[PDB]
Amino acid sequence: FTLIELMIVIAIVGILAAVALPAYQDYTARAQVSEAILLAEGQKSAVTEYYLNHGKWPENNTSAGVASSPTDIKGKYVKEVEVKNGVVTATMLSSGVNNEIKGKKLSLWARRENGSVKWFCGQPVTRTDDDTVADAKDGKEIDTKHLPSTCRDNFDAK
Amino acid sequence: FTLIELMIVIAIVGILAAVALPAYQDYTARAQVSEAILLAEGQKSAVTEYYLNHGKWPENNTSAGVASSPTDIKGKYVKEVEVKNGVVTATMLSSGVNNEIKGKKLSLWARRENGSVKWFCGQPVTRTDDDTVADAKDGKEIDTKHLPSTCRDNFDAK
Amino acid sequence: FTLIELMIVIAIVGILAAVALPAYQDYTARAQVSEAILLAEGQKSAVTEYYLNHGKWPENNTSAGVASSPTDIKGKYVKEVEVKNGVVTATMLSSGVNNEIKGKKLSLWARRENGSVKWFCGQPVTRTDDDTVADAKDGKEIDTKHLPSTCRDNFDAK
Amino acid sequence: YRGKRVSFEFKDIDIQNLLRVIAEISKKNIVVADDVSGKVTIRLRNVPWDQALDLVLRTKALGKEEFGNIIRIAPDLMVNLLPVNYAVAADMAARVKDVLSERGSVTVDQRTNVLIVKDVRSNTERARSLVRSLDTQTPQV
Numbered sequence: 001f002t003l004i005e006l007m008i009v010i011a012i013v014g015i016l017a018a019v020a021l022p023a024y025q026d027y028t029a030r031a032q033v034s035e036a037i038l039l040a041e042g043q044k045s046a047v048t049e050y051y052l053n054h055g056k057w058p059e060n061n062t063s064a065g066v067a068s069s070p071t072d073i074k075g076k077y078v079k080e081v082e083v084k085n086g087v088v089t090a091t092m093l094s095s096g097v098n099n100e101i102k103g104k105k106l107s108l109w110a111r112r113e114n115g116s117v118k119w120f121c122g123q124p125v126t127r128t129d130d131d132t133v134a135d136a137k138d139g140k141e142i143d144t145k146h147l148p149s150t151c152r153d154n155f156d157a158k
Numbered sequence: 159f160t161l162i163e164l165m166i167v168i169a170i171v172g173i174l175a176a177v178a179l180p181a182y183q184d185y186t187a188r189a190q191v192s193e194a195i196l197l198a199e200g201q202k203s204a205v206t207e208y209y210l211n212h213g214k215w216p217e218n219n220t221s222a223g224v225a226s227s228p229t230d231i232k233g234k235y236v237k238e239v240e241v242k243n244g245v246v247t248a249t250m251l252s253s254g255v256n257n258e259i260k261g262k263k264l265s266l267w268a269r270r271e272n273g274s275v276k277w278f279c280g281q282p283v284t285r286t287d288d289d290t291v292a293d294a295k296d297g298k299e300i301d302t303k304h305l306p307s308t309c310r311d312n313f314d315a316k
Numbered sequence: 317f318t319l320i321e322l323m324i325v326i327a328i329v330g331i332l333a334a335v336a337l338p339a340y341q342d343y344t345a346r347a348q349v350s351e352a353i354l355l356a357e358g359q360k361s362a363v364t365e366y367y368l369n370h371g372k373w374p375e376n377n378t379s380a381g382v383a384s385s386p387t388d389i390k391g392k393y394v395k396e397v398e399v400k401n402g403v404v405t406a407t408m409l410s411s412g413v414n415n416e417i418k419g420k421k422l423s424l425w426a427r428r429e430n431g432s433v434k435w436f437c438g439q440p441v442t443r444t445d446d447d448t449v450a451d452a453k454d455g456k457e458i459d460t461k462h463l464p465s466t467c468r469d470n471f472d473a474k
Numbered sequence: 475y476r477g478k479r480v481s482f483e484f485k486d487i488d489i490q491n492l493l494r495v496i497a498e499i500s501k502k503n504i505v506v507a508d509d510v511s512g513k514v515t516i517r518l519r520n521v522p523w524d525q526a527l528d529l530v531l532r533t534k535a536l537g538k539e540e541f542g543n544i545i546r547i548a549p550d551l552m553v554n555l556l557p558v559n560y561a562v563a564a565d566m567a568a569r570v571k572d573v574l575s576e577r578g579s580v581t582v583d584q585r586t587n588v589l590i591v592k593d594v595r596s597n598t599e600r601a602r603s604l605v606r607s608l609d610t611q612t613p614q615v
Contacts, residue, residue, distance in 0.1 A: 001162045001163070001166055002162055002163060002165065002166010002167055002169065002170060003166045003167070003169065003170035003173075004167070004170060004317045004318055005167050005170040005171045005174055005317070005318060006170035006171065006173050006174035006177065007170070007318065008317055008318015008319045009174050009178075009318055009319070009320070009321050010174065010177060011318065011319065012318060012319035012320060012321040012322035012323070013178075013181075013321045013322065015319075015322050016321055016322035016325050016326065019322065019326060020325075020329075023329075076308070096307075149412075150392070440568065442565070444608075444611035445611065445614070448611070450569070450608060450611075451568065451569045451572065452568055452569075453566070453567070453568030453569025453570065453571060453572040454567065454568025454571070455567065455568055455571035455572065456568060457568065457572070
């Protein structure tokens with residue numbers, strides 16, 4: 001006979017949350033990845049200096065002169081950050097993150113410019129030789145959709 | 159004989175407002191607290207620098223190099239922001255806020271990482287020693303329900 | 317009869333993006349220009365030394381002792397950086413930038429202080445004599461709105 | 475877009491008249507639509523006409539389309555030729571574009587490295603002072 005204004009408006013806010021759910025869920029993940037990136041950076045300094053001073057990429061965190069323990073460079077969504085031959089990889093925690101990005105990671109690596117180096121940011125990579133890295137293809141890479149426009153670099157970016 | 163469509167639909171919008179009342183009232187409070195947090199932050203800079211440059215936490219706002227007057231770091235819902243030995247506490251005004259959060263506050267404190275510091279955000283805390291704080295247990299802490307997921311830190315968080 | 321909460325809130329986020337569109341679009345461009353500036357600088361060193369050691373401004377990159385190829389001093393938003401008689405100009409790429417700043421550039425030039433030099437930063441300029449430059453007026457100049465407060469120098473700044 | 479040199483002096487005349495006059499001088503056979511615009515004032519010296527035309531278009535007047543024999547046109551200030559002896563005309567283009575902004579006035583680059591300006595006298599004066607001033611650091615070879 002009457003009461004449909006309360007019933008529809010409680011059911012439009014319910015469906016509004018369902019529509020606002022995936023937007024907040026990638027905005028959210030995309031936000032938790034933007035930090036793995038900040039934790040990865042700032043460690044470029046150590047790595048850059050080590051390379052320019054010696055001409056060899058730092059083998060591990062201790063070589064680069066950073067928390068000798070990967071797990072000591074963690075965060076809220078970051079379970080750690082390891083330096084492996086100049087390549088700095090950041091791992092996403094398992095608690096406090098999206099759902100399709102946890103335990104997932106990215107890498108920052110550089111290239112000899114000769115007198116200086118240039119840095120790249122993208123999906124996990126392994127270093128082959130002092131001037132070549134390759135996709136750490138394995139299945140734990142953070143999905144392209146979660147990576148900034150500034151971190152879409154490919155293993156062979158120059 | 160007839161007119162019930164006008165009577166029920168005026169009474170479903172009335173009850174719709176009553177159901178939408180508590181949702182807007184915590185969404186609202188949760189919004190007024192999210193600012194106390196923004197006002198608390200951005201003062202991390204001063205505090206961080208003071209600590210790294212001297213190795214001692216800033217005793218008060220003036221030491222940290224900020225509005226020497228706590229009341230000078232207020233807002234719409236924020237009655238102020240005081241720095242007490244590196245701990246930055248934000249107080250909720252008494253006018254313009256929820257009802258169960260006014261005159262209530264939170265704290266931001268940091269910890270020596272050695273070469274850098276890490277910040278925490280949560281319910282009011284007091285600093286004991288340069289690397290230890292404790293619950294400013296007293297009854298004026300902003301209720302957990304009003305605090306973001308990013309500001310649920312405990313006095314002993316590391 | 318009911319569902320307007322979902323319809324309005326999907327249409328307020330839509331218009332919120334439209335209002336947040338121009339803010340992120342000049343904040344963004346202003347960010348891509350701040351780098352053309354960083355790429356331009358750090359090349360002041362070469363140019364300064366060349367001038368103080370010889371009393372003549374470096375004619376080109378090779379003279380200044382930098383990547384003999386302008387295109388070798390590029391970036392993400394920077395298509396290059398050329399040294400033309402001590403004046404260092406930075407060109408904005410065509411891909412990855414705003415829209416009203418691509419292919420656009422700025423210049424850094426210096427002036428003999430006698431025993432040292434002082435640097436300026438602003439819209440493109442050409443060098444006339446060893447102590448005088450002019451507006452590289454091209455209509456290719458990066459618009460004043462996109463330039464930092466520290467890079468508003470005029471051709472005759474002293 | 476090449477012609478004899480001329481001086482255009484038009485004191486409050488229909489662009490249709492300037493057009494016809496321009497056809498009576500063998501600068502094509504020019505024909506407008508009917509109602510193109512109205513009346514304009516310009517005063518040029520030493521300008522080939524086909525240019526004084528492009529320049530008339532920009533004042534108030536129309537754009538031109540040529541059939542070949544006939545041309546259809548559809549809906550003081552002065553002109554002065556600046557010689558550029560020392561510099562290339564294109565190097566001025568950045569600075570000259572920057573005075574104009576959203577003003578009226580224009581600059582035309584002829585092939586023989588001469589600039590031509592239509593505008594108000596006050597915008598002509600500015601453009602000349604800059605063109606000559608930048609030419610002058612170029613003469614010290």
